[PDB]
Amino acid sequence: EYVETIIAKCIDHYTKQCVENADLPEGEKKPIDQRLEGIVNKMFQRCLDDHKYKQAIGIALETRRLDVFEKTILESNDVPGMLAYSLKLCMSLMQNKQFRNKVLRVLVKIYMNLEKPDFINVCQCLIFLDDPQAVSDILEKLVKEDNLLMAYQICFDLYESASQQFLSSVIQNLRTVGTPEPKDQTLKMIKILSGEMAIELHLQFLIRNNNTDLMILKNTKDAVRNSVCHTATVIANSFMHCGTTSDQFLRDNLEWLARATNWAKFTATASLGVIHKGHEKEALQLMATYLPKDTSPGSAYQEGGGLYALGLIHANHGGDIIDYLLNQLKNASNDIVRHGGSLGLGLAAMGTARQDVYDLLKTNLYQDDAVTGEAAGLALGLVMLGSKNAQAIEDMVGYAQETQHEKILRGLAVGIALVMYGRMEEADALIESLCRDKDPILRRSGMYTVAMAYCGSGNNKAIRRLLHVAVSDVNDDVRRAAVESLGFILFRTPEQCPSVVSLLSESYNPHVRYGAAMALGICCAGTGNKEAINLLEPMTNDPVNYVRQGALIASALIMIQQTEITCPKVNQFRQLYSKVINDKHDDVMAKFGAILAQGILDAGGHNVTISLQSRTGHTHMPSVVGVLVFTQFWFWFPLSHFLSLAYTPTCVIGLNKDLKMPKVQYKSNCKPSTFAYPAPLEVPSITAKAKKKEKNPARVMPAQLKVLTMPETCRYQPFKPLSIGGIIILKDTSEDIEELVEPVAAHGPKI
Amino acid sequence: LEEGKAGSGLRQYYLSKIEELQLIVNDKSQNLRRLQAQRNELNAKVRLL
Amino acid sequence: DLYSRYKKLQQELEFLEVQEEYIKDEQKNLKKEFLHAQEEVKRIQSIPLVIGQ
Amino acid sequence: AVDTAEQVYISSLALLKMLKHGRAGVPMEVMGLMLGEFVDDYTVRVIDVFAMPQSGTGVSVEAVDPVFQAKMLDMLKQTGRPEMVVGWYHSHPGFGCWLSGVDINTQQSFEALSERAVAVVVDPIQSVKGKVVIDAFRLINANMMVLGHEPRQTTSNLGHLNKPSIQALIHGLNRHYYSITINYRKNELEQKMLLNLHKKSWMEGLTLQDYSEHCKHNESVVKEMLELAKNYNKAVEEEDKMTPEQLAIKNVGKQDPKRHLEEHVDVLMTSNIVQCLAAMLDTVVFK
Ligand SMILES: [Zn+2]
């Protein structure tokens, strides 16, 4: 008892002093006696006799010591399980990034010394540390190892996610390496940074997996109005026809689109830009073929929607036409090239951090107009991702209070909000200083700005003033715009959100109910937590149309990618279907958010979905941007078109060669009828193998990734054991004739 | 050995007492948020007035 | 899993501990709003009025 | 053929001028003119608002004297008021805030110059002092009956425009007669000057004068309020003696709407003034 209490309090005070001295690496270092190290490391080594495979990395991490864990991984079984369990424990402790990066950059030196390098550790580290010195070795080891098949996975997912400007630097870092196996390394380095092969395969299986029903579109035509929901019908049509380039639905008649000269045609052409994407010739040619007669359209919304739609098409592409968009933006026109051209050019130049678009953007916002300054802010936030210019923040906040318009204040609000990414240790005094501003719009801009800065649940301090300004402030602007940052920082755990926002479900004012509905919409999206679903029933019935609209949107963001046999969704399916027939006795905006909510489930024909994080746990920047701008439809409804930037299709990839397409057929341990499609009305115990072939992989639930079983009789098999869904390649095991090459499609709606 | 079962055993029991303190904070949050729902329902009721 | 429950649980300790000052703010502010709306609906009742039956 | 989403900016100038003009809002018809500056299409800001002399005819185009209007506007031009007129306002007591044929005719005649022609009708006569909710009116084009009525974007603020939901006037006369949303604006000078001015309007001169008045009235006047307070306390306890019988018999359901608790809590709050001011007397006696 005595010995275990004195070593218990001795270890507690030991790690207490280790925490008190862990944040101060140099200067005023407190003296630590050596006998404490002896008696802590003595019983610690006694625990490290066999390590019991549970406390080695735990106590090794609690002591915050440098070489305490290097001797633990020396004699240890299942090294990948020890590094995967190690990083799993490290990612769940709410690190401050002061030591996590060092622990990772020192734990990546062990697998290079082993017989083979692993990819899960270099991915799970390179998604957090983002250091150039940790990739310069692995990019040049690909030539020394002379292994082509293993590099395609790491190249595909590193070029896929976890970085934008670090990729903009690694593309020239790999461009410098090589010639200014020479014949093979050239096609390797060229073909790995392409990134258009994913767009080609997505266009392929997504071009041959579409499923459309006449009941939905016919119901929209039955409930369409000429004033409000006209944009809801075309945005739902853009949702369901995204990626498939199916303009044949809009080729039925021209009297249903251009019947009114207003922003409805701009949202119709922008919705057309949401329909088709990833085209270098059919996009500009399709936009120019509409009226190549006089070069003078009576309605300029076709041109502005051509520039905004073109910016939607060429988002994050490597073959940008920005050089031509500067000479096209130089033309003097009335607010079409300014607003739509600023949005399209800024979206196409997102992450480039070019000073040219900064200069022309500033001279575009120097006209004091609220619309071109709103689009100028939306574009400046996108292009300034990670730049953090010195005079830009002070120039925008100085440009804010010297004008009376509100769209300029919200445009520069999102502009200074999106620019702040990864500035956790920097924007403390900036956001804390700008939180006491007299302007409520900028008060919302502080929370929207701190939203993306504190992603990952790394700061429990900002929630104090988020909820403190949500409850304490008298203006409902920061109250309904407050909890979006709470969901953006607490997006990691879906269970903990409804426990603390359940009080906000039925709040005092309807504004906190609506913003809380957005919070439940963003926090539980893509998950299966019923803690919001059981609370959706009180949200959908209230005399206020705000909580009904946000309740239908929040209900629409959860029912996506879900089967009926797992959970009883009949209640929200029926109450969601009764809104388009009950629209006669409902409000004009309630049916707008109703059918707009119905377009979410039918988006892409159940094939494409959304995701807040990647497979390795890192969060996608264009997904968070797309969902926050998607929630910014309250002030400006045409801003909802950025939802396509967050569409992440769920499927698998078994592509072995860049030009050869194999066929991989696995089997599932579940029932095939439970995973089928909920076929609607006409309105005129184990499967032998899966339905994924020629790799056209269909949708896949994240819970289905644990029940997949590769066949033992399969002719081909990759080198890496396929355990979780992602992007991998196929390894030719037979290395013989009859690779089963399949042809390619032909001209049509796509290229 | 006799540390993970005894030393970390009493450390885990102290963690269970910490779970009891989080049960006092837990149910204090529960009844405080239920009274918060009562005051919110009454002030919302006079708001309906 | 056995030893990870401590440090993993600490995140729940912070997430539940942060709600204390929050529910303090709600219970101190919503009653101020309760007397605001209470006096607002109280001052509606004016002395000049008509007497019926 | 184009329409946008306009919103009328209302500062405290036009508000307080419509409150003094509402105090002078006699049953007789009154006239007023709003001023401001047009910066863009979908925003309108009012700054200068004055009143007009009454006439036996009332609200009419003949009552508007062009030499008096242009004379006062010129006298505003020689001063630091370089703003053009943006609309005209008036009062409609009793019969509702709706617009008659004469008002829509002088509106049609006065909208030939300004395309916006903001119209505001203040009616503080039957409106309670709890709310000062005012609404701005607009004129629709007679040729837009074939197409949609109001092709106004940003339909979010219509939920805030649904607060005037009277079941006779808004949709009782909504044909050819619609409305527009209203927002406010306040800078830091109005916030601190008017906030500290109202707090001082509820405070004292030196702020130390009327404290000892109540601190020493606790011994002379409040003693009567404490004895009467105990008379109400005992006057409820005489029934609280009978409460444990019913509570000792039924225990199911509540039939008396009286709570007997919060009133006594308020009595304790009024009784705590002695405790809170005892330290005040301790400070006055000390130093
Ligand atoms: Zn009259």
Gist?
This is part of a larger assembly, with chains A (751 residues), B (49 residues), C (53 residues) and D (287 residues). Chain A is an all-alpha fold. Helices cover 48% and strands 2% of the residues of chain A.
What does this structure look like?
The structure is cut from a larger assembly and holds chains A (751 residues), B (49 residues), C (53 residues) and D (287 residues). Chain A has 751 residues and is mainly α. Chain A has 34 helices and six strands. Chain B is mostly helical. The N and C termini of chain B lie far apart (69 Å). Chain C is mainly alpha-helical and 53 residues long. Chain C has helices spanning 4-17, 19-42. Chains in contact: A-B, A-C, A-D, B-C, C-D. At the A-C interface, helix 3, helix 25 and helix 28 of A face helix 1 and helix 2 of C. Bound molecules: zinc ion (ZN). The PDB classes it as hydrolase. The entry lists the keywords p28, 26S proteasome, regulatory particle, 19S, gankyrin, hydrolase.
Topology:
The structure is cut from a larger assembly and holds chains A (751 residues), B (49 residues), C (53 residues) and D (287 residues).
Chain A: H1 2-20, H2 34-47, H3 56-62, H4 79-90, H5 100-107, H6 119-126, H7 136-145, H8 148-158, H9 165-176, H10 182-192, H11 196-205, H12 214-223, H13 230-240, H14 263-275, H15 282-288, H16 301-313, H17 322-329, H18 336-348, H19 355-365, H20 370-383, H21 390-400, H22 407-418, H23 428-434, H24 440-453, H25 462-472, H26 476-480, H27 483-489, H28 496-505, H29 510-523, H30 536-539, H31 545-556, H32 570-577, H33 588-601, E1 608-610, H34 621-631, E2 647-649, E3 653-654, E4 667-668, E5 708-709, E6 727-728
Parallel strand pairs in A: 3-6
Antiparallel strand pairs in A: 1-2, 4-5
Helix pairs in contact in A: 13-14, 13-33, 14-16, 16-18, 17-18, 18-20, 19-20, 20-22, 21-22, 22-24, 24-27, 27-29, 28-29, 29-31, 31-33
Chain B: H1 7-48
Chain C: H1 4-17, H2 19-42
Bound molecules: zinc ion.
